[PDB]
Design a protein around this ligand. Structure first.
Ligand code: SF4
Ligand code: SF4
Ligand code: F3S
Ligand code: NI
Lengths: 530, 262
């Protein structure tokens, strides 16, 4: 009794989700990652210095992050100690990746599963507009919204809706439950956040070299000497600030408003088992030196929280298009494709299935904001404490698709804030007359290396086994490989698979729900499958 | 129906660098564009519907006067079954659509030349756009680079519906942008000609702006406009004291590497 929705539109990559229904509820979800490149293959026998470049091309939505885990993984097999100045640049930059990535993911990739652009054409400007100020410490003039409305009015007058063409909220959908006023508020931002997103990137270019796909890191870390001028340490901050206002006075508010009118979603999204590596290290060989705490949460118990141990993490196949069925931890992993056609040998996805201890685990911000929470990180709580309230729920409400979604606003906060410190710190030593970027290093006869990045979608880890300055094995496990991606040998469903199950669907022919849960996990199939 | 020129944006075996890079247009902002300028008739990253609803869209879309934009390069592979959408292979979806457009334009070194995926051993045997849809009479205009820089794209399409089929170079790249090399317009030229290079990233020379020939820079053999338009209206690889890797040359991955030598 299966519904299929290939492609999953507003995401990155090619995702096919097939669901089976039993009277309004999902009963079996399948995450079918549908394209393959195979970079780990391409990489064999090259100089590990090059690697950081190939992999960076794992994807471009989540630009840079694959660069990082790559600089970091060799730095590790080489055992370099990069000038803390370099530590500063790299975490500075990651911070913007968060800002940009998330800003453009709620509005531009998640909104429409909630907002009813159409609906807005109704909405009373003066009304919606007056709502604004009540919700945001930002004066939203009737003229503004009044424009937006005509700007969309002219979308019907044109005959072409382009982007909105076969929209699931066209002619109203039962599942879209927003006051026309709110939509005219949402949309107005959607369109703005399209402008901000430039800035959020313009600033990342500064350290970064260019946005998208970064060019400023090296084993020995960082090369951008020019970015040290105060003349340029200023130019960042000024962008940094304005992108931060938007995010604070606007992305944060809307997540809240909408999340309001959709409180029932706080009761749907069935996930247990979270984990994180942590990010923004202060000493590069200590996960415990990271701004955002590294931690593991089994089931839903926010009271245990044990240490992340990368020993017991081994991708699987069996229900993946790769030879055999046996599993391996990165450092000893293999990558030679099968392809059995679709459900062939029961295989359905190009993504290997990275099982933790033995269990599935959901990485990303939810896991992040749970791990932080369960460990005093102050800014994290101060953040939820308010959400959880504005909403008027409890911890278990965080375990939902509403949680998962919400958490992502917070993560972008518990980072947008911090950025402030690192820039300062950097500007300090520059002023000092300390401009150390890059450290001299050398290749051991042979070594092993591993770099953990907690990418905007979670726990990223690159893993190198080098022999004589040539790559002997450079395999990688990426967030989305955890979240989306097949079942294991022990047929355990995956984060999202289970999240889909029990999801009620009001209209199969236009299933907004399939999409609200899959988009909450910000699926990135190009990464996932690499 | 009416308004602006129908554009069909197809996502093959890409990484979304090129789509993201597109959102970065300025002057022609993405809002102005996607609204008062073009009419993004089909684009999987921004489409409000999903699955079936959008398939119907493309269908109708590729019925009119449209410009095809193909991001990625196709897994022609040991079948071509490496990339499927709607359950159909990426070649097939392409053979279908490309041939019906007033003009096709391949974005990023993947679409154009073959990209990351096509590097040795090329397990998916992926190839460039008009090196696969050629036999079908497709002669795409290549907007090279990994990824290409807004204006090279935008400026290129603008040029289309305005003036016409842009004069192209040997590698099928608009000469109005890929004319000159990177080196030609690079500031550290002075040092190249004077013989002043950096021998390491952490070095006095490096810190004072010495040319990168040494360190591995490839501006010499790379035609792009980066030095002069430059990314996010704020920088470029060399300005950031990092070697140029020939990210817009037909076989950079396997050609112009090791990227830290020569
Ligand atoms: S050309 Fe480069 S940026 Fe564009 S999709 Fe290909 S790998 Fe990504
Ligand atoms: S840095 Fe590179 S592109 Fe610039 S002048 Fe030197 S060799 Fe040429
Ligand atoms: S690396 Fe590529 S982005 Fe421009 S500076 Fe060189 S052609
Ligand atoms: Ni990604």
């Amino acid at each position: 009794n299966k519904i299929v929705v290939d492609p999953i539109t507003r995401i990155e990559g090619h995702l096919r989700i097939e669901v089976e229904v039993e009277g309004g509820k999902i009963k079996n979800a399948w995450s079918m990652s549908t394209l393959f490149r195979g970079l780990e293959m391409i990489l064999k026998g090259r100089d590990p210095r090059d690697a950081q470049h190939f992999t960076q091309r794992a994807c471009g939505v989540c630009t840079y992050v694959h660069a990082l885990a790559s600089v970091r993984a060799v730095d590790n097999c080489v055992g370099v100690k990069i000038p803390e100045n370099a530590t500063l640049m790299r975490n500075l930059t990651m911070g913007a990746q968060y800002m940009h990535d998330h800003l453009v993911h709620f509005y531009h990739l998640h909104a429409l599963d909630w907002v009813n652009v159409a609906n807005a054409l109704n909405a009373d400007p003066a009304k919606a507009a007056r709502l604004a100020n009540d919700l945001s410490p930002r004066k939203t003039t009737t003229e503004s919204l009044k424009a937006v409305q005509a700007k969309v009015k002219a979308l019907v007058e044109s005959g072409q809706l382009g982007i909105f063409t076969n929209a699931y909220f066209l002619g109203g959908h039962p599942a879209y439950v927003l006051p026309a006023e709110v939509d005219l508020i949402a949309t107005a931002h959607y369109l703005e956040a399209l402008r901000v997103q430039v800035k959020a990137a313009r600033a990342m270019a500064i350290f970064g070299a260019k946005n998208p796909h970064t060019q400023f890191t090296v084993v020995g870390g960082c090369t951008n000497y020019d970015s040290l001028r105060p003349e340029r340490i200023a130019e960042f901050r000024k962008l940094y600030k304005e992108v931060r206002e938007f995010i604070e006075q606007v992305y944060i508010t809307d997540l809240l408003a909408v999340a309001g009118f959709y409180k029932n979603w706080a009761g749907i999204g069935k996930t247990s088992n979270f984990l994180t590596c942590g990010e923004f290290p202060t000493d590069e060989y200590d996960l415990n030196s990271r701004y955002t705490p590294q931690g593991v949460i089994w089931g839903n118990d926010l009271s245990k929280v044990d240490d992340f141990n990368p020993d017991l993490i081994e991708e699987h196949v069996k229900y993946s298009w790769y030879e055999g069925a046996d599993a391996h931890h990165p450092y000893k992993g293999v990558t030679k494709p099968k392809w059995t056609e679709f459900h062939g040998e029961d295989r359905y996805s190009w993504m290997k299935a990275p099982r933790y201890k033995g269990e599935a685990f959901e990485v990303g911000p939810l896991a992040s904001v749970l791990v932080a929470y369960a460990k005093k990180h102050e800014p994290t709580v101060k953040a939820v404490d308010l959400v959880l309230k504005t909403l008027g729920v409890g911890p278990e409400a965080l375990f939902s698709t509403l949680g998962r979604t919400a958490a992502r606003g917070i993560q972008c906060l518990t980072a947008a804030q911090e950025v402030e410190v690192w820039l300062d710190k950097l500007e300090a030593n520059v002023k000092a007359g300390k401009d150390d970027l890059y450290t001299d290093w050398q290749y051991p006869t042979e070594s092993q290396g591993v770099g953990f990045v907690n990418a905007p979608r979670g726990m990223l880890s690159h893993w190198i086994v080098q022999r004589g300055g040539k790559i002997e094995n450079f395999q990688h496990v990426v967030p989305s490989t955890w979240n989306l991606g097949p079942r294991c040998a022990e047929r355990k469903l995956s984060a999202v698979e289970q999240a889909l199950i029990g999801t009620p669907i009001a209209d199969p022919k236009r299933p907004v729900e399939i999409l609200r849960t899959v988009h909450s996990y910000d699926p990135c199939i190009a990464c996932g499958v690499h | 129906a009416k308004k602006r020129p129908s554009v069909v944006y197809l996502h093959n075996a890409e990484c979304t660098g090129c789509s993201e890079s597109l959102l970065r247009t300025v002057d022609p902002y993405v809002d102005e564009l996607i609204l008062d300028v073009i009419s993004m008739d089909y684009h999987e990253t921004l489409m409000a519907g999903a699955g079936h609803a959008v398939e119907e869209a493309l269908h109708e879309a590729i019925k009119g006067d449209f410009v095809c934009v193909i991001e990625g390069g196709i897994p022609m592979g040991d079948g071509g079954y490496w990339g499927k959408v709607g359950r159909r292979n990426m070649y097939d979806i392409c053979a279908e659509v490309a041939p019906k457009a007033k003009a096709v334009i391949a974005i990023g070194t993947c679409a154009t030349y073959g990209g990351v995926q096509a590097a040795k051993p090329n397990p998916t045997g992926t190839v460039g756009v008009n090196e696969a849809l050629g036999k079908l009479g497709v002669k795409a205009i290549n907007i090279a680079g990994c990824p290409p820089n807004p204006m090279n794209f935008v400026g290129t399409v603008v040029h289309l519906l305005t003036k016409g089929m842009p004069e192209l170079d040997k590698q099928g790249r608009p000469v109005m942008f890929f004319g000159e090399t990177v080196h030609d317009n690079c500031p550290r030229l002075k040092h190249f000609e004077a013989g002043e290079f950096a021998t390491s990233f952490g070095s006095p020379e490096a810190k004072k702006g010495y040319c990168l020939y040494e360190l591995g820079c490839k501006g010499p053999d790379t035609y792009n406009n980066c030095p002069k338009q430059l990314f996010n209206q704020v920088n470029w690889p060399v300005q950031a004291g990092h070697p140029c890797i020939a990210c817009s040359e037909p076989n950079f991955w396997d050609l112009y590497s090791p990227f830290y030598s020569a």
